[PDB]
Homo-oligomer: A and B are copies of this chain.
Amino acid sequence: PIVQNIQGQMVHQCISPRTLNAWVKVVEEKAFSPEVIPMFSALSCGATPQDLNTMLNTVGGHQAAMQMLKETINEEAAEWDRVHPVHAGPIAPGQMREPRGSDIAGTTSTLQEQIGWMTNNPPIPVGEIYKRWIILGLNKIVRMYSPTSILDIRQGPKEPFRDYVDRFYKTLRAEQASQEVKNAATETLLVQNANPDCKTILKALGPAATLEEMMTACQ
């Protein structure tokens, strides 16, 4: 990845064995839990598309999942070649060149072109545009690894209310719902899917109470 030294010149360093071993052991332990994506965004900090393709290629299993990631990048590369068309023929374009969809993806671009693109006065964040293509592709992977939906999450009879909300928001995080979708679930679905006793306890609280004073009610 590109790093900032003491001076501020964006020099290029190679990916460490610590970062390589960290990303591989996340996927081996947890397959495609929703917290893997937050981890990916942190291990690949300022990474070149050569370094971003290295982290995807070192994953051993989940080859059905990595084909969805490969088809999503090919959809975004074709979208980038449509929204950003070529101006004219490169008769006098210099050594630099406007990146296509296959140059941001690291397929038709060398390492020296990717280091230059990110260091331009007006930096072309090809390491950041390609990261949003993987993350949008990783959100589709973790959506099919969700074992259940939010409509099937109901509280057990001997299950405490802290374990039910733990299962409720773990399923809601797996379906990758938005803030507006999650706001409707915490006011119209969390109370109604509880046990009858706790549910009543929660209908007496009022129309909308925060979860800090809710869970304590059913302690």
Contact = CB atoms under 8 A, between A and B. Distances in A.
Interface of A: 1, 3-9, 11-22, 30, 33, 35, 38-39, 41-43, 45-46, 54, 57-64, 66-68, 71-72, 84, 87-89, 91-92, 94-96, 116, 119-122, 124, 140, 144, 162, 165-166, 168-170, 172-173, 186, 210-212, 215-216
Contacts of A43: 17, 20
Given A72-B212, A121-B116, A54 B35 contact: no
A216 B91 CA distance: 41
Contacts of A30: 60
A39 B25 CA distance: 13
A87 B169 CA distance: 39
Contacts of A21: 22
B39 A20 contact: yes
B15 A45 contact: yes
B71 A95 contact: no
B71 A96 contact: no
B42 A58 contact: yes
A173 B63 contact: yes
26 contacts: A5-B6, A6-B9, A7-B7, A8-B9, A9-B9, A14-B42, A14-B46, A15-B42, A17-B19, A17-B43, A18-B18, A20-B42, A21-B22, A35-B58, A42-B54, A62-B166, A64-B165, A64-B166, A64-B169, A67-B211, A84-B92, A88-B88, A94-B124, A95-B121, A144-B162, A144-B216
